[PDB]
Design a protein around this motif. Sequence first.
Motif, PDB file in Angstrom:
ATOM      1  N   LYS B  54      54.778  43.085  24.202  1.00 51.36           N
ATOM      2  CA  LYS B  54      54.602  44.226  23.309  1.00 51.36           C
ATOM      3  C   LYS B  54      55.864  45.073  23.272  1.00 51.36           C
ATOM      4  N   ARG B  65      62.971  47.624  11.132  1.00 51.93           N
ATOM      5  CA  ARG B  65      62.613  48.644  10.145  1.00 51.93           C
ATOM      6  C   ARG B  65      63.808  49.515   9.791  1.00 51.93           C
ATOM      7  N   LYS B 127      42.898  38.652  20.334  1.00 50.95           N
ATOM      8  CA  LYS B 127      43.538  39.867  19.836  1.00 50.95           C
ATOM      9  C   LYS B 127      45.055  39.704  19.808  1.00 50.95           C
ATOM     10  N   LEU B 179      40.963  48.864  17.065  1.00 47.15           N
ATOM     11  CA  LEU B 179      42.105  49.675  16.657  1.00 47.15           C
ATOM     12  C   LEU B 179      43.131  48.843  15.894  1.00 47.15           C
ATOM     13  N   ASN B 180      43.526  47.704  16.463  1.00 50.39           N
ATOM     14  CA  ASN B 180      44.609  46.917  15.873  1.00 50.39           C
ATOM     15  C   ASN B 180      44.159  46.196  14.611  1.00 50.39           C
ATOM     16  N   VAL B 183      44.347  48.622  11.913  1.00 46.78           N
ATOM     17  CA  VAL B 183      45.725  48.761  11.433  1.00 46.78           C
ATOM     18  C   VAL B 183      46.122  47.561  10.575  1.00 46.78           C
ATOM     19  N   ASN B 231      44.455  57.707  14.141  1.00 45.72           N
ATOM     20  CA  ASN B 231      44.673  56.932  12.926  1.00 45.72           C
ATOM     21  C   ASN B 231      43.815  57.451  11.787  1.00 45.72           C
ATOM     22  N   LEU B 234      45.437  60.409  10.376  1.00 45.38           N
ATOM     23  CA  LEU B 234      46.584  60.010   9.573  1.00 45.38           C
ATOM     24  C   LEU B 234      46.156  59.484   8.208  1.00 45.38           C
TER      25      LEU B 234
ATOM     26  N   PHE D   1      54.185  55.460  11.974  1.00 42.05           N
ATOM     27  CA  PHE D   1      53.345  54.275  12.116  1.00 42.05           C
ATOM     28  C   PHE D   1      52.030  54.595  12.843  1.00 42.05           C
ATOM     29  N   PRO D   2      50.964  53.867  12.510  1.00 46.57           N
ATOM     30  CA  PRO D   2      49.683  54.080  13.190  1.00 46.57           C
ATOM     31  C   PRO D   2      49.695  53.481  14.588  1.00 46.57           C
ATOM     32  N   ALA D   3      48.760  53.946  15.415  1.00 46.78           N
ATOM     33  CA  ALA D   3      48.712  53.513  16.802  1.00 46.78           C
ATOM     34  C   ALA D   3      48.075  52.132  16.948  1.00 46.78           C
ATOM     35  N   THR D   4      48.685  51.295  17.786  1.00 47.42           N
ATOM     36  CA  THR D   4      48.140  49.997  18.198  1.00 47.42           C
ATOM     37  C   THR D   4      48.361  49.870  19.702  1.00 47.42           C
ATOM     38  N   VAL D   5      47.552  49.059  20.381  1.00 51.29           N
ATOM     39  CA  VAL D   5      47.719  48.849  21.817  1.00 51.29           C
ATOM     40  C   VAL D   5      47.832  47.381  22.138  1.00 51.29           C
TER      41      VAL D   5
END
Lengths: 236, 236, 5, 5
Positions: B54, B65, B127, B179-180, B183, B231, B234, D1-5
């Motif tokens: 990660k 980016r 995941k 969560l991911n 996103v 999120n 946001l 950016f949005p949060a990811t873990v």
Amino acid sequence: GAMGSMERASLIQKAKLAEQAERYEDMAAFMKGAVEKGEELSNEERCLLSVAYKNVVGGQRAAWRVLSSIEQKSNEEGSEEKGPEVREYREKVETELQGVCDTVLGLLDSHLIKEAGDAESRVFYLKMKGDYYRYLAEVATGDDKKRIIDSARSAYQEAMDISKKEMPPTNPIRLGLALNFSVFHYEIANSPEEAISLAKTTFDEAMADLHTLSEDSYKDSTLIMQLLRDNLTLWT
Amino acid sequence: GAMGSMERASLIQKAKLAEQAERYEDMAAFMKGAVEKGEELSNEERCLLSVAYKNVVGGQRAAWRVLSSIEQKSNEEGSEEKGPEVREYREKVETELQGVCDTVLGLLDSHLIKEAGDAESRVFYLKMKGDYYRYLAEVATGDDKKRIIDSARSAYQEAMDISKKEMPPTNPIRLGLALNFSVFHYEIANSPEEAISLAKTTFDEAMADLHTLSEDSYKDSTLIMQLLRDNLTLWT
Amino acid sequence: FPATV
Amino acid sequence: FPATV
Ligand SMILES: *SCCN(C)[C@H](O)C(C)(C)Oc1ccc(Cl)cc1
Ligand SMILES: *SCCN(C)[C@H](O)C(C)(C)Oc1ccc(Cl)cc1
Ligand SMILES: [Mg+2]
Ligand SMILES: [Mg+2]
Ligand SMILES: [Mg+2]
Ligand SMILES: [Mg+2]
Ligand SMILES: [Mg+2]
Ligand SMILES: [Mg+2]
């Protein structure tokens, strides 16, 4: 060299892009390729070279200090034997650090220093030579440790002699050289009194020359004077 | 593999040292070597694997980016032609990123996922598979871009189906997956309504299960619930 | 650590 | 950016 096929200007352009992306290993590789084109470096290009390798070796030194501290704790009274792994990994990081220092010293020796005639370039490169021998000295323990320390001292001293003759006392390169040579005295040469004396005399002589400077030069010089003051406050 | 001669336990030990030193490339190389020993990973070792890669790919994405933004600006109206250098260097970083993603996906496919039978390991690895296909999707532009996106979706969906059947709604792995995947919906699949719906339903179902938890489990779960809330704030 | 540039 | 873990 893997950069031999890229244009010098493209290497400089990409070094600047790498800095923007905080990709300092790339930045150093691009600047190594630029140096190996064989042409002298401009003021700006010398800064790119210095920034790239300062960031790479700075990260290695930070990691080495973490691992050395873990290693020292592991060898104190009452610690449980954890095997060779800590020493091995500290040695791995140390070897990579030494490799980077040797690469930089090799660029300075072949052939940046011998072609640098102006005070601003020659003092800059000799300061760098002192810096990277200092980083080698930080991890040195063998038969050549005293010679590594003296190589750092000798490079710093030649840079000081030129800077005092050829540069005003507020010149940021002269100031940064004195800052780092002072740290060499304090941390490497076990000479805290010399470190303090050099930092104080450098600061006071620059203070008395500030009145000659434009606003922008004043900002550049006072920035490094504040670093001298910070060290003096740490040391006194 | 360069780690084939090191003991599995030594690789795990050094991965932890590398994390302490913030040497995440080393950490990932050590954990890759540990995976290639062929034994299943513990909960803690799965965390070490995930953290290492990660951090590596996170730095690459951040750099990509920066460079992509510079590249887009260079191709807008009125910009001066700067040559191929920006695109070349963005492509260099992009290729290195893809290489890391392919390496992680290769570890998952050979053979972490097929040997993972417990919900906590299987959902964790699926995941991860969704995550690294998502990172490939972020830079994808060619004939297989839709297939890359669907590979991410498919991995996330299998992980969701297992997590809803086999894990309580406060399980931190279930929460982090949701969560991911949320996103992924928002940023990759152009489905902001699905992203918001998933984040909200995940948050509310975890809220209603908090009363079953110890203080330490409560802290773990509410930490990731707050990321869901961040999120949602946001996005709404 | 002390400051260097 | 949005949060990811
Ligand atoms: S040469 C690299 C850019 N310089 C201007 C630095 O960023 C700072 C630290 C501001 O200034 C100096 C660096 C090195 C030296 Cl030898 C002198 C000043
Ligand atoms: S598994 C890596 C360590 N975990 C505990 C992380 O540091 C945090 C972010 C605190 O928690 C999670 C990471 C990943 C997942 Cl899938 C769930 C929780
Ligand atoms: Mg040419
Ligand atoms: Mg050694
Ligand atoms: Mg003197
Ligand atoms: Mg063995
Ligand atoms: Mg490409
Ligand atoms: Mg649903």
